[PDB]
Amino acid sequence: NDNYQNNYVVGRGTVYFDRFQDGTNRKTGEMYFGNTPEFTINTDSETLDHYSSDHGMRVMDASVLLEASQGGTFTCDNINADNLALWFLGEVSNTTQTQQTDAKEVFNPIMRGRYYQLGTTDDNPTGVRGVTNFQMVKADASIAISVGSGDITSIVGATVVNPAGNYEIDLEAGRIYIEPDSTDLSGNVQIAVQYDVDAQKRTLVIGKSNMVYGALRMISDNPVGLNKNYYFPKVSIAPDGDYALKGDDWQVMSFTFKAMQLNNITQRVYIDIVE
């Protein structure tokens, strides 16, 4: 048979993952990754080989597969909180920050020519955003300041600082820049501050250190060649390589997955054939 019609194929498809509820096989539901530049399946394998000791040199008597480790790599261009939480071995948390007025804080060590983030606490460890009002007072750094009640001008040894030539404020970011040549804040100075925090909805990804299991699936829409879909009933997802935040290319996360047997009845991978 000379003329045989080959299935020459150019790969294109949508990749989905469903995180299991931690400590279980219970599916949360298939999140689409967005655009994946690559999706590759790999298989390292090791074999136990037996050689005859009764005849010849290195005549193989037997061999068996010890394991083939099915698994793979994929990248995605789509940067969002779900993909980032999956890459950072962690969790998306959505919150509204507490609207608070006359929130007060102290910066006991200060160097000028530096940035300070307002409202860094266990509730918001990346700090406040959206400040409506701000004021600050300087003091000598050896003074043991505390600010339990009243405005910051009430505290012992303190003096009001005007902004011009002493500080700049990014009200949206919640950030103070102490000016690098500032006259009022040279020497052994400390600061106390006071601000008003707006109510706003905000998303964090928290990079904890948890092994993320789930089921992986690629559905293919190949522009040439017959299409076929891939399902991995359990995988463990992990970050692969490194994630470049600056460069002339598009940002990509890279993921690696190891395929696993969900239970003793299921295969590690199923390929579904359209025709």
Question: What resolution in angstrom units was achieved for this structure?
Answer: 2.7
Q: Give the sign of the dihedral formed by CA 31, CA 206, CA 212, CA 15.
A: positive
At which residue do the structure tokens 């994630």 appear? 243
Query: How far apart are alpha carbons 3 and 7 in whole angstroms?
Result: 13
Tell me, rounded to whole angstroms, the distance of Cα 4 from its chain centroid: 48
At which residue do the structure tokens 């600056």 appear? 246
Query: How far apart are alpha carbons 211 and 221 in whole angstroms?
Result: 31
Q: Tell me the technique behind this structure.
A: cryo-EM
Residues in the chain: 275
What is the maximal distance between C-alpha atoms in the chain? 98
Angle at alpha carbon of residue 233, lines to 231 and 235, rounded to 5°:
100
CB-based contact 75:36 (threshold 8 Å): yes
At which residue do the structure tokens 């009764």 appear? 54
Query: How far apart are alpha carbons 206 and 88 in whole angstroms?
Result: 8
At which residue do the structure tokens 């005859």 appear? 52
Question: Which amino acid appears at position 256 of this protein?
Answer: T
Query: How far apart are alpha carbons 162 and 170 in whole angstroms?
Result: 15
Beta-carbon contacts of 55 under 8 Å, excluding residues fewer than 6 positions away, are none
How many Cβ atoms are within 10 Å of 94's Cβ, its own excluded? 9
197 φ, ψ (degrees, to nearest 5): -100, 125
Beta-carbon contacts of 256 under 8 Å, excluding residues fewer than 6 positions away, are 71, 72, 73, 237, 238, 239, 240
- CA torsion 205-209-214-216 (nearest 10°) is 70
- CA torsion 93-96-97-98 (nearest 10°) is -130
Cα–Cα separations (whole angstroms), residue 68 to 47, 48, 268, 271: 9, 12, 11, 17
Q: Which of 74, 126, 54, 68 is nearest to 97 (CA)?
A: 126
Question: Which amino acid appears at position 41 of this protein?
Answer: I
- CA torsion 19-25-30-32 (nearest 10°) is 40
Query: How far apart are alpha carbons 122 and 91 in whole angstroms?
Result: 16
Query: How far apart are alpha carbons 110 and 176 in whole angstroms?
Result: 12
Instruction: Provide DSSP, the chain.
Output: ---------B--EEEEEEEBPTTS--B---EE----S-EEEEEEEEEEEEE-SSSSSS-EEEEEEEEEEEEEEEEES---HHHHHHHTTSEEEEEEPPPEEEEEEEE-S--SSEEEETT-BTTBTT----EEEEEEEEEETTS----SSS-GGGSTT-EE--STTTEEEETTTTEEEE-TT-STT-SSEEEEEEEEEPP-EEEEEE-----EEEEEEEEE--SBS--EEEEEEEEEEEE-S---SSSSSPP-EEEEEEEE-SSTTS-S-EEEE--
Q: Give the sign of the dihedral formed by CA 32, CA 33, CA 34, CA 40.
A: negative
CB-based contact 135:160 (threshold 8 Å): yes
